[PDB]
Design a protein around this ligand. Structure first.
Ligand code: CHL
Ligand code: CHL
Ligand code: CHL
Ligand code: CHL
Ligand SMILES: CCCCCCCCCCCCCCCCCC(=O)OC[C@H](CO[C@@H]1O[C@H](CO[C@H]2O[C@H](CO)[C@H](O)[C@H](O)[C@H]2O)[C@H](O)[C@H](O)[C@H]1O)OC(=O)CCCCCCCCCCCCCCCCC
Ligand code: CLA
Ligand SMILES: CCCCCCCCCCCCCCCCCC(=O)OC[C@H](CO[C@@H]1O[C@H](CO)[C@H](O)[C@H](O)[C@H]1O)OC(=O)CCCCCCCCCCCCCCCCC
Ligand SMILES: CCCCCCCCCCCCCCCCCC(=O)OC[C@H](CO)OC(=O)CCCCCCCCCCCCCCCCC
Ligand SMILES: CC1=C[C@H](O)CC(C)(C)[C@H]1/C=C/C(C)=C/C=C/C(C)=C/C=C/C=C(C)/C=C/C=C(C)/C=C/C1=C(C)C[C@H](O)CC1(C)C
Ligand SMILES: CC1=C[C@H](O)CC(C)(C)[C@H]1/C=C/C(C)=C/C=C/C(C)=C/C=C/C=C(C)/C=C/C=C(C)/C=C/C1=C(C)C[C@H](O)CC1(C)C
Ligand SMILES: CC1=C[C@H](O)CC(C)(C)[C@H]1/C=C/C(C)=C/C=C/C(C)=C/C=C/C=C(C)/C=C/C=C(C)/C=C/C1=C(C)C[C@H](O)CC1(C)C
Lengths: 35, 222, 44, 221, 50, 222, 243
């Protein structure tokens, strides 16, 4: 169970880190318009 | 943020005053701090800059190596009683178990302090005689202070502006590590416990567990 | 006792970490994502 | 050897390429060591040479002088008030006072303030005559660092060759004596036994009786 | 609010004995671990976040 | 006259037995008795930095010596005006008393308990003060770095440069005497554990036995 | 700098822009004096002669009331924390030496010395000292000198000086030679003086109402904010609760 807990914990913090740094990676510049 | 030239930030900010003329601002970390005039001439400045940067790298390695093993001791790596506390780590070689890297008996497991010092003398003497001279079996012409080449495997030091910015990061991180190494040396003597132990005592009750509790402990008493 | 459990419920357990390796891998994984993000800068 | 472009170096083959340009080997004991670089100024370098020279000589006096009481306690059983040098001063605080070789009628000194006053005035007048380079014609000359006149009775100052290698021998023996003097000083604070006593205890078992055996003595509590 | 709890009459405590009363707060928990362990705490049963 | 203190005809750091003194010491600065056998100030601007150090230290040590003596002079017969902290090297712990640090025996004076607050207030105030000293501020922006003399001399004093120079010689000789004294206070405190005034009174009781000679056996190794 | 916030046509008035158009100010206060907020509901100013003549009395009242504010707040506080003052409270300090009971002077930090001279000597030298000073003030005639700013000045310096601002002998530390900073400090002085005048009149009415000193007022108010204020003191005794 502890091995499963460490596995789910690293999976969740990996995906949440992807979300955090993806929205930090200049997101208001992804528009297809002018401005 | 203009880390070079006359418009660089100085060691007192808005109240800095006119920096010394030899500290023009062409070298990394130039905060215009030479109040004792040690580097008026170029040669003392070059030698002192070498002492700076060599000490900076030695202190970065030192600060990480003082922080790491006692952190791992708190993590479950089994250092018994003195391999955790940095200033007592050297005393670990005399115990019946020897000196075990990461607490495992299969790792290192050293018993001869004379042998480990002798191997270190020949290795570091060759390395430092090579560093001073600027020649080795495989490298011919390299900067004595910023060598590179085989010392830059990742190609990180290529383009001059990134090189200079990383030099500023190097010198400032090194100065911070030198400051913390002075801190480790002083808190070792006056408290008698590890640096992270000092931190966790300061994290429990900072209002009383600080450096002011250990001020009266060195009063010479008749 | 008849069977082995974590018994991590309650206790005000920060981030739900009962062993330090959990906090270490959380910090380490956020650090790896930050490392790739940071080195992959000065782009676009 | 010891002079000119192929002089000996403080790192040997490792001091071939990076050497200071101010260390040209005109002076005895020159090996090229200014890694910290405290002598980029020429007259400042001259002042440090003066410091190094008489420092070496004073160290030679100390190094020979703090072996002889303990060596004489060894072998032919010479008795003292106290033989070990770092506890020699308390000899003057004993009941029998200070005696040169244990004889009550050798010097028998008890007035420590008076001997301090005598030593201060005599060595002060000696040093003042040294630094001034003589006055009113009484030795009112010489280089004040290698005098020779009225200080070299054996006359081993001629033959500029022999003077050069003898000067190198002087500074090099002095540097050995300074290194030894730091040995005596640090063994005094760490071991608390005489230099010869530490060498005697050293010959029994070097494996367990090294400097690491007292490496845990100064562990903070 | 801190000043009101420390020197301006105290605040109402239901955990004081006798049914609770208005008590003057003495020695608040300034421990950072106790303060931020509530924040880092899970919101679910047994922990309830803050 | 003033020639005793300036020019080649001045007094010397070894008197009539000093001709080989150093040639960069022309006799244009206060003090300057010719004592530079180490030769550290042969460099001109490092010499300038060293004079700045000299005068700043001189002023600080005049204040320090007169402050290390003045509480122990103002101590009374029963010892109720000040507690045990009338001795200078135990003054700081006076802020750890339940009555706090009170400037005299009356609790109406200062009455400070927060050493952290006192340290932070001192750091901020002294930072602004020394930044004004190095760069310039309300008290001056282009005055002399060592002798500003426009708000720092409100009682006139520094007129008629003939008297001004010899008064500066008084500054530097009083200062150097003070730093010699402060070195005395430190080395007396570390080897006795007694206040400087009681060192003086114990010596005035018995000068043959009450001297550092009696304390020369204190640091002996076992 | 920033002297266009106290002088000129654009300056801080006694009301902001919405409640006071700039044309509502008296014409004789258009930013020529330090502390000109255009505050004149009742026409006492008339014109510039009467304005500067009243400013003379305003400035003297200010320079008295500021020292007064310090002299009422300081020794009462010193006695309250434990100095040996015996009469720090201002409305009963005079009652100490009615029967020869001379006051104790605190030369802080080296003070608490007894003043060995009685009320008759106090008042005789007080009139002969400040009467001499005030006769000097209207005449601009001063006998001797030795001021720190200019040492041992003769009597031929007070003539030609500006009345109500006599720089030189009365300026030991200078810091007013720049007219810019001198004007800024004039505004600072007159505003501090008006503040202290309000403060000392508040001290008076607070003493008349509460029967105690203003340092006691601020200390008890900081101890119990709602339990000690004006509406608390005029209650007399408690309050019937509304339960
Ligand atoms: C006429 C002879 C004359 C002589 C010999 C000296 C000698 C000296 N002057 Mg003086 N002066 C003289 C005339 C004059 N001086 C001055 C004005 C000054 C000033 C203003 C100053 C001196 C200073 C000095 C000293 C500089 C050298 C030094 O530091 O040595 C080092 C000294 C020694 C190595 C002697 C050590 C003796 C030893 C017995 C000490 C005790 C040892 C302990 C028992 C153990 C200690 C170590 C242990 C703990 C391990 C020195 C002692 C300077 C100084 O150093 O002041 C403090 C200084 O600032 N002189 C004037 C007036 C213009 C003079 C006029 O004639
Ligand atoms: C030049 C300044 C200075 C000096 C010399 C001292 C010295 C001392 N303080 Mg103090 N302090 C100083 C400044 C300050 N202190 C405090 C606040 C306190 C407190 C709260 C306490 C002390 C205490 C002590 C004593 C510690 C006991 C002891 O024997 O320690 C070792 C010291 C000696 C054996 C004396 C000889 C000193 C010498 C070896 C060192 C001189 C060189 C310095 C390293 C120079 C450092 C320069 C600075 C700018 C980095 C000690 C003599 C404690 C005390 O009195 O306990 C009874 C105490 O409780 N200090 C503040 C904040 C307001 C300071 C601000 O500047
Ligand atoms: C270079 C000179 C020199 C040195 C190194 C020493 C060293 C010593 N003497 Mg000393 N002395 C010296 C000169 C003189 N002594 C005396 C008179 C006495 C007496 C009467 C006594 C001593 C004692 C001592 C010891 C101090 C006690 C102790 O354990 O301290 C701590 C010791 C150490 C930390 C180790 C050794 C110190 C060394 C590393 C420091 C060297 C510092 C300087 C570089 C030396 C030069 C300083 C000045 C002169 C320029 C110590 C080992 C005492 C003793 O032995 O009691 C048992 C004692 O009673 N001395 C006189 C006057 C005649 C001297 C010179 O004129
Ligand atoms: C300049 C303003 C001034 C003010 C506002 C007061 C105000 C006061 N004095 Mg006073 N005095 C003043 C100046 C002076 N007094 C005195 C001498 C006295 C005495 C001797 C007494 C007062 C008393 C009083 C109080 C009762 C009336 C009262 C609050 C009386 C008091 O304290 O009653 C409680 C009282 O007995 N005053 C002298 C010296 C002659 C003064 C000189 O300027
Ligand atoms: C991660 C974020 C997840 C948020 C939802 C998860 C469930 C949160 C929850 O368990 O909620 C309840 C918690 C409190 O938990 C309770 O906390 C209580 C704490 O009380 C204890 O402690 C108290 C101390 O005074 C008392 O003494 C009390 O009597 C004692 O029992 C008990 O332990 C309960 O068992 C426990 O369930 O609230 C909280 O943490 C407050 C935090 C916000 C919760 C918001 C719920 C709604 C969330 C989103 C709605 C948005 C929808 C938008 C999109 C559509
Ligand atoms: C967030 C609130 C706020 C802000 C940012 C402003 C800002 C401004 N007001 Mg204004 N005003 C406010 C609220 C506010 N007002 C309220 C509540 C009132 C009714 C009393 C007024 C009535 C008012 C008038 C009549 C005028 C202005 C004017 C102005 C302008 C400049 C002059 C000035 O300082 O006014 C002065 C305002 C005061 C002197 C009120 C006293 C403010 C002090 C400093 C109170 C200290 C605050 C303290 C923390 C209490 C807050 C408690 C809080 C918990 C509720 C300026 C841009 C002027 C203007 O319009 O220019 C053309 C003008 O004529 N205001
Ligand atoms: C709609 C709006 C949002 C709605 C509701 C928000 C309300 C409150 C938000 C704060 C709640 C508390 C925050 C800390 C929660 C926490 O640390 O959980 C930690 C908990 C603790 O987990 C458990 O703890 C127990 C004891 O505390 C035991 O130890 C268990 O073993 C352990 O698993 O785990 C989780 O809840 C999983 C968190 C995963 C989060 C994924 C979503 C994040 C997405 C984006 C983040 C962006 C930035
Ligand atoms: C149980 C423990 C888990 C608790 C999670 C919280 C841990 C504490 C982190 C709080 C830091 C606050 C981040 C605010 C700025 C982030 C925006 C950014 O990123 O801005 C990005 C910006 C871009 O230039 O850079 C920058 O400003 C520099 C970024 C500063 C962030 C410092 C990170 C600390 C060390 C990272 C991991 C140690 C790495 C080890 C793993 C690596 C592989 C082994
Ligand atoms: C700039 C200036 C200018 C002005 O004017 C003048 C002046 C003052 C001169 C100046 C300043 C200066 C300074 C600041 C200095 C300082 C320094 C330092 C601190 C160093 C350290 C430095 C430090 C260092 C190197 C450190 C190092 C460390 C090390 C190696 C360590 C090691 C180790 C480890 C890992 C762990 C184990 O278990 C133990 C050991 C083995 C032990
Ligand atoms: C070159 C260089 C270059 C780079 O770059 C930089 C640097 C690093 C800086 C450098 C180096 C330097 C060095 C090495 C130094 C060292 C020195 C020494 C060791 C000294 C001693 C020195 C030492 C000495 C003098 C000593 C002396 C001694 C004595 C007197 C003694 C006395 C005594 C006696 C007899 C007897 C009695 O019973 C005791 C006593 C009293 C005790
Ligand atoms: C010239 C020459 C030349 C040749 O060639 C070479 C050589 C040898 C290098 C030379 C010499 C040099 C010298 C002599 C030096 C010395 C110095 C000093 C001693 C300083 C002090 C200096 C000193 C000082 C600043 C001091 C200061 C002090 C202070 C702050 C104090 C404070 C205090 C007090 C009040 C009291 C209380 O309760 C405590 C406290 C709070 C703590």
């Amino acid at each position: 169970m502890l091995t499963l807990k460490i596995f789910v914990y690293t999976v969740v913090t990996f995906f949440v880190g992807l979300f955090i740094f993806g929205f930090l990676s200049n997101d208001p510049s992804r528009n297809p318009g002018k401005g | 943020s203009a880390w070079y030239g006359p418009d660089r930030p100085l060691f007192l900010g808005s109240l800095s005053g006119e920096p010394p003329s030899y500290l023009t601002g062409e070298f990394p970390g130039d905060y215009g701090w030479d109040t004792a005039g040690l580097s008026a001439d170029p040669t003392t400045f070059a030698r002192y800059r070498t002492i700076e940067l060599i000490h900076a790298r030695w202190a970065l390695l030192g600060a990480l190596g003082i922080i790491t093993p006692e952190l791992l001791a708190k993590n479950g790596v089994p250092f018994s009683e003195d391999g955790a506390i940095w200033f007592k780590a050297g005393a670990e070689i005399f115990k019946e178990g020897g000196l075990n890297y990461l607490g495992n008996e299969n790792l290192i497991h050293a018993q001869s302090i004379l042998a480990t010092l002798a191997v270190q003398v020949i290795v570091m003497g060759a390395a430092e005689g090579f560093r001073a001279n600027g020649e080795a079996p495989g490298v011919e012409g390299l900067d004595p202070l910023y060598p590179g080449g085989p010392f830059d495997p990742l190609g990180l030091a290529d383009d001059p502006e990134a090189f200079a910015e990383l030099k500023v990061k190097e010198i400032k991180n090194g100065r911070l590590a030198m400051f913390s190494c002075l801190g480790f040396f002083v808190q070792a003597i006056v408290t008698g416990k590890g640096p992270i132990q000092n931190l966790q005592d300061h994290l429990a009750d900072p209002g009383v567990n600080n450096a002011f509790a250990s001020a009266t402990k060195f009063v010479p008493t008749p | 006792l008849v069977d082995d459990r974590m018994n991590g419920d309650g206790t005000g357990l920060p981030f739900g970490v009962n062993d330090g390796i959990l906090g270490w891998v959380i910090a380490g994984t956020l650090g790896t994502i930050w490392a790739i993000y940071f080195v992959s800068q000065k782009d676009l | 050897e010891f002079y000119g472009p192929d002089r000996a170096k403080f790192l040997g083959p490792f001091s071939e390429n990076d050497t200071p340009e101010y260390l040209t080997g005109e002076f005895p004991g020159d090996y090229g060591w200014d890694t910290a670089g405290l002598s980029a100024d020429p007259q400042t370098f001259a002042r440090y040479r003066e410091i190094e020279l008489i420092h070496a000589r004073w160290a030679l006096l100390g190094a020979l002088g703090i072996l002889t009481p303990e060596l004489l306690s060894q072998y032919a059983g010479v008795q003292f008030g106290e033989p070990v040098w770092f506890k020699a001063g308390a000899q003057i605080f004993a009941a029998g006072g200070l005696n040169y070789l244990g004889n009550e009628s050798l010097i028998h000194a008890q007035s420590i303030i008076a001997t301090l006053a005598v030593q201060v005035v005599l060595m002060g007048l000696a040093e003042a005559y040294r630094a001034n380079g003589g006055s009113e014609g009484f030795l009112d000359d010489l280089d004040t660092l290698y005098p020779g006149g009225a200080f070299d009775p054996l006359g081993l100052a001629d033959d500029p060759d022999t003077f050069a290698e003898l000067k190198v021998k002087e500074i090099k023996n002095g540097r050995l004596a300074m290194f030894s003097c730091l040995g005596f000083f640090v063994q005094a604070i760490v071991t608390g036994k005489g230099p010869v006593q530490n060498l005697t205890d050293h010959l029994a078992d070097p494996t367990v009786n090294n400097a690491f055996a007292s490496a845990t003595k100064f562990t903070p509590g | 609010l801190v000043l009101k709890a420390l020197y301006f009459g105290g605040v109402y405590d239901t955990w004081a004995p006798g049914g609770g009363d208005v008590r003057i707060i003495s020695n608040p928990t300034t421990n950072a671990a106790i303060i931020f362990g509530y924040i880092v705490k899970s919101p679910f049963g047994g922990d309830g976040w803050i | 006259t003033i020639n005793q203190f300036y020019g080649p005809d001045r007094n010397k750091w070894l008197g009539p037995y000093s001709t080989n003194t150093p040639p960069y010491l022309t006799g244009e600065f206060p003090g300057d008795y010719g004592w530079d056998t180490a030769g550290l100030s042969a460099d001109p601007e490092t010499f300038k930095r060293y004079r700045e150090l000299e005068l700043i230290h001189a002023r600080w040590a005049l204040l320090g010596a007169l402050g290390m003596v003045t509480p122990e002079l103002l101590q009374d017969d029963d010892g109720i005006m000040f507690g045990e902290s009338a001795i200078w090297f135990k003054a700081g712990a006076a802020i750890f008393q339940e009555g706090g640090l009170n400037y005299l025996g009356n609790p109406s004076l200062i009455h400070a308990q927060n050493i952290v607050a006192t340290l932070a207030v001192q750091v901020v105030l002294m930072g602004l003060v020394e930044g004004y000293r190095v760069n310039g501020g309300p008290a001056g922006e282009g005055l002399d770095p060592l002798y500003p003399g426009e708000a720092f001399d409100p009682l006139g004093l520094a007129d008629d440069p003939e008297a001004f120079a010899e008064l500066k010689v008084k500054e530097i000789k009083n200062g150097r005497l003070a730093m010699f004294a402060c070195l005395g206070f430190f080395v007396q405190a570390i080897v006795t554990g007694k206040g400087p005034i009681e060192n003086l009174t114990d010596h005035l009781a018995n000068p043959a036995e009450n001297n550092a000679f009696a304390y020369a056996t204190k640091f002996t190794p076992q | 700098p920033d002297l266009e916030k106290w002088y000129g046509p654009d300056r801080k008035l006694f009301l902001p822009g919405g409640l006071l158009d700039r044309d509502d100010v008296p014409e004789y206060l258009n930013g020529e004096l330090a502390g000109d907020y255009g505050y004149d509901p009742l026409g006492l100013g008339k014109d510039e002669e009467q304005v500067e003549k009243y400013r003379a009395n305003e400035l003297l009242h200010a320079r008295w009331a500021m020292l007064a504010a310090a002299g009422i707040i300081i020794p009462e506080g010193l006695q309250a924390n434990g100095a040996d003052i015996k009469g720090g409270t201002w409305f009963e300090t005079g009652a100490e030496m009615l029967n020869g009971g001379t006051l104790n002077y605190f030369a802080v930090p080296f003070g608490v010395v007894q003043n060995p001279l009685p009320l008759a000597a106090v008042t005789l030298i007080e009139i002969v000292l400040l009467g001499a000073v005030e006769k000097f003030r209207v005449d601009g005639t001063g006998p001797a000198g030795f001021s720190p700013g200019v040492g041992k000045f003769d009597s031929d310096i007070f003539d030609g000086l500006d009345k109500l601002y006599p720089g030189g002998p009365f300026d030991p530390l200078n810091l007013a030679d720049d007219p810019e900073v001198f004007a800024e400090l004039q505004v600072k002085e007159i505003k501090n003086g008006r503040l202290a005048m309000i403060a000392v009149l508040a001290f008076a009415i607070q003493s008349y109402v509460t029967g105690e000193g203003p340092y006691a007022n601020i200390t008890k108010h900081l101890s119990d904010p709602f339990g000690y204020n004006l509406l608390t003191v005029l209650q007399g005794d408690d309050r019937v609760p509304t339960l």
